[PDB]
């Protein structure tokens, strides 16, 4: 194919080709708006393996976020990527945030390219592989951390290590902090 | 440098070369010399055609 050549190309980020590509594009993205729409994905390989199909109803938005946070280390423990996903969720409120990836970074700003599906588009409402997003249980997945990075920041996975946050940390706290009393007292 | 030397109570100074090296970090200006920033791409793999 062609995307394996692309995939293994973008794994080298400080390599002289992709160094130059990233040098031009970081400046070019500064000259535009903060949240603006991309004509097409810059990394179509990574877009596609995160589930971007180049068809009507699929949108790529490019987004910018400030970096960082002991006053200057009063932390703010939510990610930069979740902040970005939420902002594009509000400017494009008719869409549904599917996934997002890293494109270019800087001293001040990390950039992302969110991928968005139009659930009202009839090319999405048919085709039984993508019409799950039209179900109203996906209205703002990025606002509730149901995206890839949100599920990471929530700490939702499997095992010993995620026992405090496997069904969600609020749910497990409320469950284990409940005096359960039966009719015939145990 | 505002700090006191361990060898002697006199103020620890910096050499010209070190001061040059600090500045060349902060404006990024190529620290290790005797290298080309722009080497020709020596095609170490495409030299031999595949059968």
């Amino acid at each position: 194919g062609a995307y394996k050549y692309l995939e293994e190309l973008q794994r080298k980020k400080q390599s002289d080709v992709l160094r130059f590509l990233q040098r031009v594009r970081v400046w070019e993205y500064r000259q535009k708006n903060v949240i603006h729409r991309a004509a097409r994905p810059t990394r179509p390989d990574k877009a596609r393996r995160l589930g971007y199909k180049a068809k009507q109803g699929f949108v790529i938005y490019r987004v910018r976020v400030r970096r960082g946070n002991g006053v200057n280390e009063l932390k703010y423990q939510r990610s930069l990527r979740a902040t970005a996903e939420e902002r594009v969720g509000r400017r494009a409120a008719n869409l549904r945030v599917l996934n997002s990836y890293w494109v270019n970074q800087d001293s001040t700003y990390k950039y992302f390219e969110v991928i968005l599906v139009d659930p009202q588009h009839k090319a999405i409402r048919r085709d039984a592989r993508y019409n799950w997003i039209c179900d109203p249980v996906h209205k703002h997945r990025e606002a509730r951390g149901l995206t890839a990075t949100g599920k990471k920041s929530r700490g939702i996975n499997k095992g010993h290590k995620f026992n405090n946050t496997k069904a969600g940390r609020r749910k497990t706290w409320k469950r284990q902090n409940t005096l359960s009393l039966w009719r015939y007292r145990k | 440098t505002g700090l006191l030397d361990k060898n002697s109570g006199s103020s620890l100074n910096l050499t010209k070369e070190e001061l040059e090296l600090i500045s060349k970090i902060q404006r990024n200006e190529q620290t290790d010399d005797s290298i080309n920033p722009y080497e020709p791409l020596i095609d170490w793999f495409t030299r031999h055609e595949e059968v």
Binding site: R126, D127, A128, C134, P136 | -
Partner: protein, 60 residues
């Protein structure tokens, strides 16, 4: 008499007036139509003809 006349000139075509349309409720005037919900993918239909859920009884 006016409304049913407008119903007759807009008979059986896409885009009839927003008052002559069904009222239902907002959440149901979104939400995938019966065709778009029962629409299964091309692969699952092959899997469903090849292996439908067979009816059985266990004793004799």
């Amino acid at each position: 008499q006016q409304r049913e006349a407008v119903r007759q000139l807009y008979k059986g075509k896409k885009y009839q007036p927003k008052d002559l349309r069904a009222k239902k409720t907002r959440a149901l005037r979104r939400a995938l139509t019966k065709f778009e919900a029962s629409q299964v993918t091309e692969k699952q239909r092959k899997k469903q003809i090849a292996f439908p859920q067979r009816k059985y009884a266990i004793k004799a």
